[PDB]
Amino acid sequence: EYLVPLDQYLAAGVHIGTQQKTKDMKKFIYRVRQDGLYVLDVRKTDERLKVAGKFLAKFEPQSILAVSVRLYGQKPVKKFGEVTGARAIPGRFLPGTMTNPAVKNFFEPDVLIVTDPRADHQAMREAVEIGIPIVALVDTENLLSYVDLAIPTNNKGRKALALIYWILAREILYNRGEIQSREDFKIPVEEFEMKI
Amino acid sequence: KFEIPVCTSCGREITPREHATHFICPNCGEAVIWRCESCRVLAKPYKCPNCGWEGP
Amino acid sequence: GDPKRQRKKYETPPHPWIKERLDRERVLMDKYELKNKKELWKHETQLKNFRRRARRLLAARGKQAEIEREQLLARLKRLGLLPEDAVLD
Amino acid sequence: TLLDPLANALSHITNSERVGKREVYIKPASKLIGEVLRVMQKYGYIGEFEFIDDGRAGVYRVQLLGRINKAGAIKPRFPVKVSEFEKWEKRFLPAFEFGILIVSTSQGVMSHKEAIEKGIGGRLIAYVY
Amino acid sequence: KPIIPMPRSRFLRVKCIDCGNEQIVFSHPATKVRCLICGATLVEPTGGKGIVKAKILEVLE
Amino acid sequence: QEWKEYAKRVLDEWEPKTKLGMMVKEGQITDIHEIFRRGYQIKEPEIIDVLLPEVNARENQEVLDIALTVRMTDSGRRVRFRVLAAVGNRDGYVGLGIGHGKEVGIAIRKAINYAKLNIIEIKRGCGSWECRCRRPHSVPFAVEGKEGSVRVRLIPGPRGLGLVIGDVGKKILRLAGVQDVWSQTFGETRTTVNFAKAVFNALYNTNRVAISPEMIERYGIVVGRA
Amino acid sequence: MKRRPRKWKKKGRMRWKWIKKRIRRLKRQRKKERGLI
Amino acid sequence: ARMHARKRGKSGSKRPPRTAPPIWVEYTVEEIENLVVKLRKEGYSTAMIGTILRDQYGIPSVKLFKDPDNPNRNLTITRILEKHGLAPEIPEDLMFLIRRAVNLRKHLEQHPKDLHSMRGLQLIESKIRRLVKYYKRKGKLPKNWRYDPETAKLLVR
RNA sequence: CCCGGGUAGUCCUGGCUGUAAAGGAUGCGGGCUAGGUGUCGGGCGAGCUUCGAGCUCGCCCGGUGCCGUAGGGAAGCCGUUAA
RNA sequence: GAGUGGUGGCCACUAUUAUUGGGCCUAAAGCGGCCGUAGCCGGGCCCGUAAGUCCCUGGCGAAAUCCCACGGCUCAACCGUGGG
Ligand SMILES: [Zn+2]
Ligand SMILES: [Zn+2]
Ligand SMILES: [Zn+2]
Ligand SMILES: [Zn+2]
C-alpha cells in the first residue's frame, strides 16, 4: 500500500506547507487550514516517491547528483549519497561546477536532485544549461519551472527532509536490486536527521 | 536524412541549440519523453504515450 | 507624351569599383580577348534577359504562356546553349 | 467594442499557439467562424472542434496540434479574381503553396487552392500558415 | 471565466410560519417578499442573498 | 583527405574534459548532426575539429569585423580589439563568434574558437515562386531575425541569382551554404555585429517553422549535410 | 505661444522663460511702433 | 466600458441556457398575463413587474413562455401590455431619463453654482438625445418629436 | 540671496482671461497572452466572539501599488493597470 | 575608353511620405479634459433582391510605342509577317 504509515508521515510533518500557494502546486495541494496554512497530499507524495525511485534506479549511481544548500538538508543529502553511491553537495554550490571545465571539482552528472528549487537556484540553472533531467523537492510556494520530476513534500522541516531522503534511498536500492526487500534496509531513520 | 526529435507536450520540433531535455519515462521505462525549452519554462504537463502517466 | 528613344542593350554594374567583380571580369576579358567592358556587359545582359524570361514564364499559366515557354526553349536550343532534351529548369 | 469576431478568434488562436496551449474557446461563435474552422481542420492545422450552446451566439471548443505558425484575418476583405492570387500569396505567405488564403466565394467558403481549381474568385477573409 | 455562466441563486419552496401557505420565492430578492395569503414577510432583501424568515421546504434549481 | 587526416590527429592527440568530448573520443557519437537538438553543451573546440574538420580551412574561415575599443583610466587610454568572425563548411553548418584581446592576432584566435563553439545547424531548400525547383540552393521559406535594432528578413530567390544582401550577410550565407536569396533589412545595418547576429538569428530561426511531411518533398528541404 | 519643450533644456542656451519675456517685450515694442497699440 | 465614466463593471444577470419553462412553475400563461395586467394597473413599470414576478410569485421570466397568439414570438411584458392596451405611450427608459433631467434642472435653477450637477445634467440630456434618435429611426416616436426642457415639464406631469 | 517694514494680490459676490513640467511627458472602446504578494469597496463560504456595522482565513467582481515568466525595446525599463 | 570629367533637374537611394509599409514615456510628435454632428468602423440567427463582388459571353478602348517567334538589309540597331 503505502511506503510509510500515515502516523509516521504526519509525525515527520511532510504535509505541513507554507502560507503561500502556487497555481503549479494547486494540483498537489490538499486543502487550506483555518489559519491560512496549506496542506499537501501524502498519497500523492508517496506515489511520486515511488515514481522517483523507479526513475532513479535506472541511472548509473555515480552520475546522480543531489544538492542541498539548506542547513536542515545538508546532512540528509550526504547520508543519501553515501548510501546510494551518488554524489552529494551540501551547503554552498560553487558556480561553474557544471559549466566551467577549468574548475578543479568539475563534474557533469546525468541527473540532478534539488532539495529546494528556490534555494538551489544556481545548481538548477547549471543543470538547465547542460541539459539533464531534474528532480525537485517542491513545497507549496515553489514553482515547477524547469522541473522534470516534482516530489511534493515539506522541503524545510528537518524530520521531513530526513524521512524523504531515507525513503528515496531505500526505494532506489530496492528497485536497483541491491536489497532483496524493503525490510532489508537496516539504516535507522534518525541517521539521516541533523543533530541539534 | 536523420530523425529530428519532437517535443512530447506541444508536438513541435526541437531547435539545434535550445535548452531541451529527453529522458526515459519514470513510470514505464520504455518510452522516451522529450521536453522543449518553452514547455520546460512554462511547466506544461506531459503524458507518456505508453502508460498515460501525466505530469512533470 | 514623348516619342520613342532608342535605349542601350547593355547594363552598367551598380558599383564601378568592387574587387571581386573586377577580378572576375578581368579574368573573363583576358580569357576571351574582348576589347571593352561593355561587350562583356552586353553578353551578361543577354544572359540576364534569358533568365528573367524563364523566371517570368515559370509562374505563368495560359495558352500564351505555353507558347512563349516553347518558343524560348526552341530559341535557346537553336542558339545551342542547351541540349535538345533540356527543360525550362 | 466588438467588431470582428473572426479576427478575435484568429488572434486568440495565434496567441495560444505561441504560448503552447492545447485547447481554446472561441466566443462569440458564428457560421463564418465555423466554416473557417472547417477549412483549417480539413487542411490539418487544427484538431477537433465542437459547437456549444449557451443561450447566446455560442462557443467553439477547438483542439490545437501545434501546427500553426501564424493565422490572421484579412481586413479589408479585398475582392480577388482567379488570376490575381499570386500577389496576395506573396503578400501573406512565406513561400509558394505554403499556407492557405481562406476566401469567401459565391459557392461557399474555401481555400484559395480550391478556388483556383474551381476557377472562381471571391473575397479574402483569412490567411493561415 | 466559465464558458457557460450559471446563476448562483436558487428558487425555494417555502412554507409560511403563520398560515402554512406554500410558495416559491427567489433567494436574491430586490423587494420585500410577502405571503400571498396572510401578507406576513418571508424574505428580507439585502445587498446579496436574502434572509429567509420561514421554513425552507425545498430548494429547486 | 587532408581534413580527415587533421580530424584523426585531433582525435588521437586530445584528452577530453567534458561528457560530449568523452562521447566523441570513445566513438558513441560519430556524426556532426548527433551533437544537436539534445541539450548538450559544447565547450571543447576539439569536438568540432573532429566531427566537422572543414571549419579550419582558410576559405571556410572569415573575419567579419575588427573594432578598436578604448577604456579611460588615470594614466590614459587602454586599447582593446574586438573581432567578429564566422566559420563553417559551405554546406549546412555555420557559426559566429566574438573575441576580445590586447592584440589583433589573439582577438582573431579567440573569435575563431568561439565561432567553432557557437556553430549551429540550418535548413535549406527552394521556396521561390520563380524557381519552384527542389534543390538546397536557398532558404526553404521566408525567415526573420533580429539583434539590437537590426531586423533582417530573408526570402527565397531563384537559382542563379546572387545573394542580394549586404557584404556581411553575403559572407555569412556563403559560409552557411546558401547561394541565392533576397533580403529586406530595417534598422542600423552599419552596426556590423548587430547585422551579423541578426543574419545568424534568421538562419537559426529557419528551424522554428512548423512544416508538413509533404513540404519537405515540395521544397527539397535539406537539414544539415546535403 | 506654441509649446517647444526641447527649448527648456539649459545646455548651451539661456532660460526659456526670460527668452519668452524678451520676445513679448519686442512684440509690444513693434506693435507700438506700428501704431496698433 | 461605461458610456461616460469608462469603468468596466460586470455585475448583472446570469440566466441559465433554457428553451422551455421550468416544470415547477405553478402558474400558466393565462394567469401570468392576468398577474402582469394586475401589477400594471397597480402602477409598476415593466422592470418592477418582472422583479415582483420573479421574487414573490416564483416565475423566473415571462420570456420563457411561447406566445399563444403568435407562434413566431415568445412572451414579453411589453407585448402583454400592448395586447391588453396598457403599453406606455413613450418608452420607459426615455421617460425615466426625462423625469430625472427635469428634477435636476429644477435643482439647478436654485443652485446655479453646482457645475458638477450641471455636467451630470448634460450627460443625461446626451443619453436622452441618443434614445430619441434610436426611437425616431425605429418609428416608435413621431418624426417631428424633439426634446425641449420647457415642454418636458408637461410630459413629466 | 539674509534681516526689519510694506502696496497690489491672496478672502466673499456678479463677470472676463482660457494659460501650466494642466505629466502617467503614455488618446479612447474590444478580444487574447504564467503567476506571486499588499490595500479599498461589495458579495459568498468557513471558523472565532465580549454577539459589535466585531476579528481571522479562503473564493468572485471592480479600483488602487510593488516584484516578476513568455515576449517587447537603442537601452533606462514596460510586462493582464503593456510600452 | 572615342570617350571621359564639371554644374543644374527627376527617380532610386529613403520603410526620410510609409495602402503594401514609418513613428509619437525618456530622442520630432497624443488636443489640458469631457459631451457630441457629418464621416469611418460595427454583435448572433432566419427568409427575400443581386447594388457592390465573382464566373461566362457580345460591342469597344486607332496606329506608332512594349514583349516573344520567324523572315529581309553581313548579324545587330531598323523594318515586315503572326501571337500577346
Ligand atoms: Zn514543447
Ligand atoms: Zn511511460
Ligand atoms: Zn402566510
Ligand atoms: Zn530553385
Element at B21 (helix H, strand E): strand B21-24
Q: How far apart are CA E13 and CA E52, in angstroms?
A: 11
For the record, the C-alpha cell of D109 comes out as 467558403
Judged by a CB distance cut-off of 8 A, whether residue C59 touches chain F is: yes
Instruction: Give, rounded to a whole angstrom, the gap between the first and last alpha carbons of chain G.
Output: 19
Q: What is the DSSP string of E1-61?
A: --SS---S--EEEEE-TTT--EEEEESS-SS-EE-TTT--EEEE--SSS-EE-SEEEEE--
Contacts of F60 (CB under 8 A, 6+ apart): F54, F87, F88, F89, F90, F175
Q: How far apart are CA C82 and CA E46, in angstroms?
A: 93
Q: How far apart are CA A152 and CA A43, in angstroms?
A: 10
Q: How many CA within 13 A on the CB side of residue C5? A: 4
A20 to A70, D67, F172: CA distances (angstroms): 19, 38, 51
For the record, the C-alpha cell of H61 comes out as 421570466
Q: Cα dihedral sign for D64, D68, D69, D74?
A: negative
Q: Which residues of A76-96 are buried (b: 16+ CB within 10 A; e: fewer)?
A: bbbbbbebbbbbbbbeebeee
**Length reported for chain F:** 226
The answer to whether F189 and F196 have CB atoms below 8 angstroms apart is no
Q: Across the beta sheet with E11-15, what order do the strands follow?
A: E22-26, E11-15, E55-59
Which residue, among B21, B38, B42, would best test binding to A if mutated, counting the most A CBs under 10 Å from its CB?
Answer: B21
The answer to whether F177 and F91 have CB atoms below 8 angstroms apart is yes
Q: How far apart are CA G23 and CA G20, in angstroms?
A: 5
Q: How far apart are CA F193 and CA F187, in angstroms?
A: 13
Q: Is A152 helix (H, G, I), strand (E, B) or coil?
A: strand
In chain D, the DSSP E strands lie at: 23-26, 46-52, 59-64, 71-73, 79-80, 100-105, 108-111, 122-128
Q: Name residue B7's amino acid.
A: C
Instruction: Please report the residues numbered 139 through 168 in chain F whose beta carbons come closer than 8 angstroms to any beta carbon of chain C.
Output: 158, 160-161
Q: Out of H16, H22, H58, name the one closest to residue E26 (CB).
A: H58
Q: Is A111 helix (H, G, I), strand (E, B) or coil?
A: strand
The answer to whether A18 and A38 have CB atoms below 8 angstroms apart is yes
Protein-covered nucleotides of chain I (CB closer than 7 Å) are 14, 20-21, 23, 25, 28-37, 42-47, 56-63, 69-70, 73-75
For the record, the C-alpha cell of D107 comes out as 459557392
Q: How far apart are CA F33 and CA A125, in angstroms?
A: 26
The candidate with the shortest Cα–Cα distance to F143, out of F191, F94, F184, is F184
Q: How far apart are CA B35 and CA B11, in angstroms?
A: 9
D113 to D32, D44, D109, D120, D127: CA distances (angstroms): 19, 15, 12, 10, 12
The candidate with the shortest Cα–Cα distance to D127, out of D84, D68, D51, is D68
Contacts of E41 (CB under 8 A, 6+ apart): E32, E33, E34, E35, E53
Contacts of D126 (CB under 8 A, 6+ apart): D6, D10, D36, D71, D72, D73, D74, D101, D102
Distance from CA(C26) to C1'(J48), angstroms, rounded: 77
A-side interface with B, Cβ within 8 Å? 24, 27, 51-52, 54-55, 58, 111, 128-129, 131-133, 143-150
Q: How far apart are CA A131 and CA B18, in angstroms?
A: 9
For the record, the C-alpha cell of G28 comes out as 509690444
Q: How far apart are CA A142 and CA A138, in angstroms?
A: 6
Which positions in chain H touch E6 (Cβ < 8 Å)?
14, 16
Q: What single DSSP character describes residue A34?
A: T
Say how far residue B54 (Cα) sits from the centre of its chain: 12
Q: Name residue B3's amino acid.
A: E
F60 to F50, F52, F95, H51: CA distances (angstroms): 16, 11, 11, 83
The candidate with the shortest Cα–Cα distance to B35, out of A138, D63, A148, D69, is A148
The answer to whether E12 and E59 have CB atoms below 8 angstroms apart is yes
Q: What is the CA radius of gyration of chain B?
A: 11
Q: What single DSSP character describes residue D51?
A: E
Q: How far apart are CA E29 and CA E47, in angstroms?
A: 9
The answer to whether A82 and A172 have CB atoms below 8 angstroms apart is no
Q: Hunting for cell 533568365 — which residue is that?
A: C51
Distance from CA(D10) to C1'(J56), angstroms, rounded: 35
For the record, the C-alpha cell of F106 comes out as 589573439
* Ion ligand 4 residue ranges (Cβ < 5 Å): F 126, 131, 133, 159
Is the bond leading into D28 cis (omega within 30 degrees of zero)? yes
The answer to whether D88 and D100 have CB atoms below 8 angstroms apart is no
The neighbour count for residue A101, using CB atoms within 10 Å, is 14
For H42, list phi and psi in degrees, rounded to 5: -60, -35
The candidate with the shortest Cα–Cα distance to A152, out of A53, A66, A27, A2, is A27
H 114-133: CB within 7 Å of strand J = 119, 122-123, 126-127, 129-130, 133
Q: How far apart are CA E17 and CA E41, in angstroms?
A: 10
For F64, list phi and psi in degrees, rounded to 5: -85, -45
Closest chain B CA to residue A56:
B26
For the record, the C-alpha cell of C80 comes out as 545551342
The answer to whether E47 and E26 have CB atoms below 8 angstroms apart is no
Element at D116 (helix H, strand E): helix D112-118
For the record, the C-alpha cell of F16 comes out as 577530453
Q: Cα dihedral sign for A160, A161, A166, A172?
A: positive
Q: Provide the pairing of β-strand E55-59 with F62-72.
A: unpaired
Closest Cα in chain F, distance from residue D80 (Å): 19
Which residues does residue C51 pair with via DSSP β-bridges, in sequence order? none
Q: Which residues of A152-180 are buried (b: 16+ CB within 10 A; e: fewer)?
A: bbbbbbbbbbbbbbbbbbbbbbbbbeeee
For F147, list phi and psi in degrees, rounded to 5: -150, 125
Q: How far apart are CA A64 and CA F87, in angstroms?
A: 37
The neighbour count for residue C56, using CB atoms within 10 Å, is 13
Q: Which residues of H105-118 are buried (b: 16+ CB within 10 A; e: fewer)?
A: beebeeeeeeeeee
**Ligand with the closest atom to the CA of F124:** 4
Where helices occur in H1-146 by DSSP H, the ranges are 29-42, 46-55, 77-83, 92-110, 115-138
| Measured torsion, CA atoms of residues F206, F208, F211, F217, in degrees rounded to the nearest 10 | 30
Q: How far apart are CA F57 and CA F7, in angstroms?
A: 12
Q: How far apart are CA D47 and CA D64, in angstroms?
A: 6
For A96, list phi and psi in degrees, rounded to 5: 85, 5
Q: Hunting for cell 508521515 — which residue is that?
A: A9
The method of structure determination was cryo-EM
Q: Is H74 helix (H, G, I), strand (E, B) or coil?
A: strand
A 22-81: CB within 7 Å of strand I = 22-24, 32, 34-36
Q: Provide the pairing of β-strand E11-15 with E55-59.
A: antiparallel
H, E, C per residue of chain F? CHHHHHHHHHHHCCCCCCHHHHHHHHCCCCCHHHHCCCCCCCCCHHHHHHHCHHHHCCCCCEEEEEEEEEEECCCCEEEEEEEEEEECCCCCEEEEEEEEECCHHHHHHHHHHHHHHCCEECEEECCCCCCCCCCCCECCCCEEEEECCEEEEEEECCCCCCEECCHHHHHHHHHHCCCCEEEEEECCCCCHHHHHHHHHHHHHHCCCCCCCHHHHHHHCCEECCC
In A64-154, the DSSP E strands lie at: 64-68, 87-90, 111-114, 134-138, 149-152
Say how far residue C80 (Cα) sits from the centre of its chain: 14
Is the bond leading into D76 cis (omega within 30 degrees of zero)? yes
Q: Which residues of C16-53 are buried (b: 16+ CB within 10 A; e: fewer)?
A: eeeeeeeeebeeeeeeeeeeebeebbeeebeeeeeeeb
Q: What single DSSP character describes residue B17?
A: T
H20 touches strand J (CB under 7 A): no
Q: How far apart are CA F102 and CA F80, in angstroms?
A: 5
